UniProtKB/Swiss-Prot annotation, chain A:
Record-given protein name: Large ribosomal subunit protein uL30A
Miscellaneous: Present with 101000 molecules/cell in log phase SD medium. There are 2 genes for uL30 in yeast.
Residues of the full protein shown: 4 to 49 of 244
Gene: RPL7A
Family as reported in the entry's similarity comment: Belongs to the universal ribosomal protein uL30 family.
Function of the protein: Component of the ribosome, a large ribonucleoprotein complex responsible for the synthesis of proteins in the cell. The small ribosomal subunit (SSU) binds messenger RNAs (mRNAs) and translates the encoded message by selecting cognate aminoacyl-transfer RNA (tRNA) molecules. The large subunit (LSU) contains the ribosomal catalytic site termed the peptidyl transferase center (PTC), which catalyzes the formation of peptide bonds, thereby polymerizing the amino acids delivered by tRNAs into a polypeptide chain.
Subunit structure: Component of the large ribosomal subunit (LSU). Mature yeast ribosomes consist of a small (40S) and a large (60S) subunit. The 40S small subunit contains 1 molecule of ribosomal RNA (18S rRNA) and 33 different proteins (encoded by 57 genes). The large 60S subunit contains 3 rRNA molecules (25S, 5.8S and 5S rRNA) and 46 different proteins (encoded by 81 genes).
Species annotation: Saccharomyces cerevisiae (strain ATCC 204508 / S288c)
From Swiss-Prot, chain B:
The organism's place on the tree of life at top rank: Eukaryota
Protein name: Protein MAK16
The family this protein is said to belong to: Belongs to the MAK16 family.
Lineage of the organism: Eukaryota, Fungi, Dikarya, Ascomycota, Saccharomycotina
Gene source species: Saccharomyces cerevisiae (strain ATCC 204508 / S288c) (Baker's yeast)
Role description: Its role might be as part of the apparatus concerned with the nuclear events of the cell cycle.
Cellular localisation: Nucleus
UniProtKB/Swiss-Prot annotation, chain C:
GO biological process: cytoplasmic translation
Any one Gene Ontology molecular-function term assigned to this protein's record: RNA binding
Protein's recorded name: Large ribosomal subunit protein eL18A
Other known facts: There are 2 genes for eL18 in yeast.
Primary role: Component of the ribosome, a large ribonucleoprotein complex responsible for the synthesis of proteins in the cell. The small ribosomal subunit (SSU) binds messenger RNAs (mRNAs) and translates the encoded message by selecting cognate aminoacyl-transfer RNA (tRNA) molecules. The large subunit (LSU) contains the ribosomal catalytic site termed the peptidyl transferase center (PTC), which catalyzes the formation of peptide bonds, thereby polymerizing the amino acids delivered by tRNAs into a polypeptide chain.
GO cellular component: cytosol; cytosolic large ribosomal subunit
Keyword Plastid included in the entry's annotation: no
UniProtKB/Swiss-Prot annotation, chain E:
InterPro entries per UniProt: Ribos_uL4_C_dom, Ribosomal_uL4, Ribosomal_uL4_dom_sf, Ribosomal_uL4_euk/arc_CS, Ribosomal_uL4_euk/arch
Name the UniProt record assigns to this protein: Large ribosomal subunit protein uL4A
GO terms (BP aspect): cytoplasmic translation
GO cellular component, one term: cytosol
Species assigned in the record: Saccharomyces cerevisiae (strain ATCC 204508 / S288c)
Length: 46, 101, 131, 220, 343
RNA sequence: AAGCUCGUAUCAGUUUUAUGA
RNA sequence: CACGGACCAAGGAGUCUAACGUCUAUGCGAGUGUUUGGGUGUAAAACCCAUACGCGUAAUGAAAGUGAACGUAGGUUGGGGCCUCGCAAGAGGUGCACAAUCGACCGAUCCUGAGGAUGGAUUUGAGUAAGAGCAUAGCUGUUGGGACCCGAAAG
């Protein structure tokens, strides 16, 4: 037949994806938060 | 086990170490990949261990399975690696499927 | 402040090696207490008697706790009764070990405790009389 | 015995010991009682995997160790509202001991052979699982078998079981559930066990939160 | 129950018979105990040495006294000999008595706890069945069938050395017996002329249950030491306080080792002795750490090496680009001039 | 030097106000 | 100021032991200590062990004695931790060692005098709170041994 991934390494991919998709979503919602933060800082300095 | 093998050879003697003046440690156990010795870079401490060697011009890749901890006579299973470089690196890759990078 | 254990018992060094990992990754203050306690010397790890374990389980709502002695568990001939509880320690003396097993409960090592309670849920850390 | 032939240091007497265990499992007239004999059989089969190192023969060996739930009490007798009649009565004693063996073993497996027993326990949960019976319904087999799964391996009110094996069963029972090939089966009562684990306090957070995310978060 | 060990014959072939592990090979391998016990035990087979009680006092010197324009060291009397008018009774003097004359009543032998001493031998036995530990210790054990190596009981009955070495060569200890014999060197010190002239490597131990000519058969083949299982010397088992000698067991010896030390089922044969308990469950940590369990109750990981946050200090006022990350209004300030403003 | 509580509001070769000879 | 230094080689000064501790490590643990010995040995090694003994395990006194549960071996207060709630911030519960407070048991108090019964007066304690030691080794201190080395008037 054909070789299969170890059931620790299978888990790895899954948990990495769980963290990675969380991290990418967290990062993406921080670029927008810093953009809004930048606008607050600009009007304060004015 | 193997952690107990490592600590007993890390200090308390791996009787094939060379202390270079650089403070570096070299395992001369013929079956290690890096000539240097460190944890799971030396073939005694680690239980899963791959290596390329040459006996003649024929470059074999030896492989050590933890299955064979009982029997040291047939520890290193070995495979010839064609001779062309491109197909040999591809030959290597398949053997190393699902191991440490 | 104490950094590393003065001990040369490599198995104790393996527990430190384990609990240093669980000290920073769990961020629960149980593991930091255990990892601090392993560094302690032999006079500062007094032996907790099996009687002090029995006293500790009289505690209200502590029927299903896993008591953890970082030092050694020692036997006491004076007491008769002993609850069915999981006790975790470094050294169980042959007498004490036999007492816990015959009573119903288990005697387990600290790495078994690290598995069963990583963050350290539903536990009690006892200490021996220093003064 | 078979504990000296399945735990041998020779490959050929372990393969021949497996084949004599195939004949020993189709010789059903001697396997009538004595739980601890089945425990010794699963300890010998545990070592019989433990000496196998190469990936293709250890997958063949895991597939045939799962298949040993198939040769032993094949479905053909196919009992009718027959409670536990010589294909389902003794079978449960062959299941529990396996889990008991793993309940004894989860400390003593190293970081290089633990994939063999994750994959083995995948195949064996799939195979008992496939032998509820040939159909996925036999009702006193469901509640007695679920009593002799519930009462040992996902107890989760006892710390005596090692906490990595219920979270691994949570990771495998969905894909290995639908390896049986949207149908309606006694699944939900199984899931009720995990709900019992969410109902059970006096435990650790990992069982409580890892099944509470991993098992319940599945849209299937 | 344990894995189980195959017994080899004198032709080096696997006989169908198998023996259970005596559970001494499940003792805690303790390098620190073996070291601190070996150092005390290696001191025991040691003789006294002392300088003579009379040496340095076999002179009749006298101090010359004050204000003689010469050093005040006690000088020898007499005359016309050369030895007259020169220093004696002094550690610095020639022919003088040494500082702290070495006396016989130095602590030569070392008292050890009997239980600690037993722990060490159990650890030393445990380390013989590891194979990697044996390879690290020395011992060319690549071409040997299995560890721990057990040979059939008929090995004991061998009378002639030629046949006995042929048994080991068939087993696979050929390389270890060529390590010794090729490693015969002169002693590098004053040991040459103190009856320690030659020095060589340690070969295999050959453990037997009872002798039938094996002790004499192997006492000439260099490096090969034999020990009765009842004894089992620490100095033999862990030479130089290094664990794991290559030990060839015999069938009867290996079975007797159960009786000698003890296990769960069998008693002990040593009065009130039990084998010591592990303070850990598993001698490896990484199964515990890289578990399904622990890695579930754990916060996410880092990079193993931090990305360098602020490596060098870029200054605003100069370098326009950094003066835009601080204060985004500086763009507006430059466009309207603002410093250059009219009232 | 080590152990024990704490990590604080524990204090300071300082200033100030307040209240006496 | 003065004492030392012509130059060069070699020699040359905190050692060893006993007594008693300190801390750390190791073994075992209410115990602990094989090595005066005997058995055994490939021989001053290693390996086994009988009966004893050493030190510790239960205290309060002066001749004579007695003897530790009103008890989750305590009531409260705190008190590392852990559990419930809360995103947190917090709050509540249980609380180790330990500390503070109120006491008790035991022995000893000031009397009451049925040889000292009985009830009151109060405190006391290397007291009990419900054992932490023994042995080996290392680091080192104290004192004696010639005692870091050399140097004095002597009987």
């Amino acid at each position: 037949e054909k070789i299969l991934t170890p059931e620790s390494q299978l888990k790895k991919s899954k948990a990495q994806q769980k963290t990675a998709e969380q991290v990418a979503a967290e990062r993406a919602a921080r670029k927008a938060a810093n953009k809004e933060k930048r606008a607050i800082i600009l009007e304060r300095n004015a | 086990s193997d952690e107990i093998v490592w600590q007993v050879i890390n200090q308390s003697f791996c009787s094939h170490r060379i202390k270079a003046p650089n403070g570096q440690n070299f395992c001369r156990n013929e079956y290690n990949v890096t000539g240097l010795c460190t944890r799971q870079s030396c073939p005694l401490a680690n239980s899963k261990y791959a290596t390329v060697k040459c006996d003649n011009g024929k470059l074999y890749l030896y492989m050590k399975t933890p299955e064979r901890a009982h029997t040291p006579a047939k520890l290193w299973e070995r495979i010839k690696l064609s001779k062309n470089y491109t197909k040999a690196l591809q030959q290597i890759d398949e053997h190393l499927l699902h191991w440490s990078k | 402040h104490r950094t590393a254990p003065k001990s040369d018992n490599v198995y104790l060094k393996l527990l430190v090696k384990l609990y240093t990992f669980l000290a920073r990754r769990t961020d629960a203050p149980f593991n930091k207490v255990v990892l601090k306690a392993l560094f302690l010397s032999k006079i500062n790890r007094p032996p907790v008697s099996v009687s002090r374990i029995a006293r500790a389980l009289k505690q209200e709502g502590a029927a299903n706790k896993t008591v953890v002695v970082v030092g050694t568990v020692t036997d006491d001939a004076r007491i008769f009764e002993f609850p069915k509880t999981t006790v975790a320690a470094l050294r169980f003396t042959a007498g004490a070990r036999a007492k816990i097993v015959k009573a119903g409960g288990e005697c387990i090592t600290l790495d078994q405790l690290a598995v069963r309670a990583p963050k350290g849920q539903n536990t009690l850390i006892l200490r021996g009389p220093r003064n | 015995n078979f504990v000296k032939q399945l735990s041998s240091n020779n490959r050929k007497t372990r393969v021949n010991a497996l084949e004599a265990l195939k004949k020993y499992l189709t010789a059903k007239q001697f396997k009538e009682n004595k739980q601890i004999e089945f425990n010794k059989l699963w300890k010998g089969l545990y070592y019989a995997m433990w000496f196998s190192d190469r990936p293709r023969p250890q997958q063949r060996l895991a597939n045939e160790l799962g298949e040993l739930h198939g040769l032993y009490f094949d479905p053909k007798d196919n009992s009718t509202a027959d409670e536990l009649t010589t294909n389902d009565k003794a079978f449960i004693k062959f299941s529990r001991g396996f889990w008991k063996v793993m309940c004894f073993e989860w400390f003593n497996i190293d970081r290089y052979r633990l994939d063999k027993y994750l994959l083995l326990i995948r195949r064996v949960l799939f195979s008992q699982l496939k032998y509820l019976q040939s159909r996925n319904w036999d009702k006193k087999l469901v509640d007695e078998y679920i009593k002799k799964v519930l009462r040992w391996l996902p107890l989760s009110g006892s710390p005596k079981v090692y906490t990595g094996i219920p979270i691994h069963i949570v990771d495998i029972l969905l894909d290995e559930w639908e390896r049986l090939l949207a149908k309606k089966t006694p699944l939900a009562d199984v899931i009720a066990i995990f709900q019992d684990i969410v109902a059970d306090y006096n435990n650790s957070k990992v069982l409580r939160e890892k099944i509470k995310e991993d098992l319940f978060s599945d849209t299937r | 129950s344990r894995p189980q060990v195959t017994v080899h014959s004198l032709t080096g072939e696997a006989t169908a018979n198998a023996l259970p592990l005596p559970a001494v090979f499940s003792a805690p391998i303790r390098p620190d105990i073996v070291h601190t016990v070996f150092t005390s035990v290696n001191k025991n087979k040691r003789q006294a040495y002392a300088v003579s009680e009379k040496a340095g006092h076999q002179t009749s010197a006298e101090s010359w006294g004050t204000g003689r324009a010469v050093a005040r060291i006690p000088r020898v009397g007499g005359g016309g000999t050369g030895r007259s008018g020169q220093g004696a009774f002094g550690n610095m003097c020639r022919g003088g008595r040494m500082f702290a004359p070495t006396k016989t009543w130095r602590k030569w032998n070392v008292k050890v706890n009997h239980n600690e001493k037993r722990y060490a031998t159990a650890s030393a036995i445990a380390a013989t069945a590891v194979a990697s530990l044996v390879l690290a210790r020395g011992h060319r054990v690549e071409k040997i069938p299995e560890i721990p190596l057990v040979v059939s009981t008929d090995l004991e009955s061998i009378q002639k050395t030629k046949e006995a070495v042929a048994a080991l060569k068939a087993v696979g200890a050929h390389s270890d017996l060529l390590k010794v014999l090729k490693s015969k060197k002169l002693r590098a010190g004053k040991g040459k002329y103190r009856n320690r002239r030659w020095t060589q490597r340690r070969g295999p131990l050959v453990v037997y249950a009872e002798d039938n000519g094996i002790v004499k058969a192997l006492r000439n083949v260099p490096g090969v030491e034999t020990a009765n299982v009842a004894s089992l010397n620490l100095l033999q088992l862990a030479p130089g306080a290094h664990l794991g000698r290559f030990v060839i067991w015999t069938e009867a010896a290996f079975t007797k080792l159960d009786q000698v030390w003890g296990s769960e089922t069998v008693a002990s044969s040593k009065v009130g002795y039990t084998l010591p308990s592990h303070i850990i469950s598993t001698s490896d940590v990484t199964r515990i750490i890289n578990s399904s369990e622990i890695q579930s109750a754990i916060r996410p990981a880092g990079q193993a090496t931090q990305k360098r946050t602020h490596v060098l200090k870029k200054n605003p006022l100069k370098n326009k680009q950094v003066l835009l990350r601080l204060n985004p209004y500086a763009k507006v300030f430059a466009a309207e001039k603002l410093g250059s403003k009219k009232a």
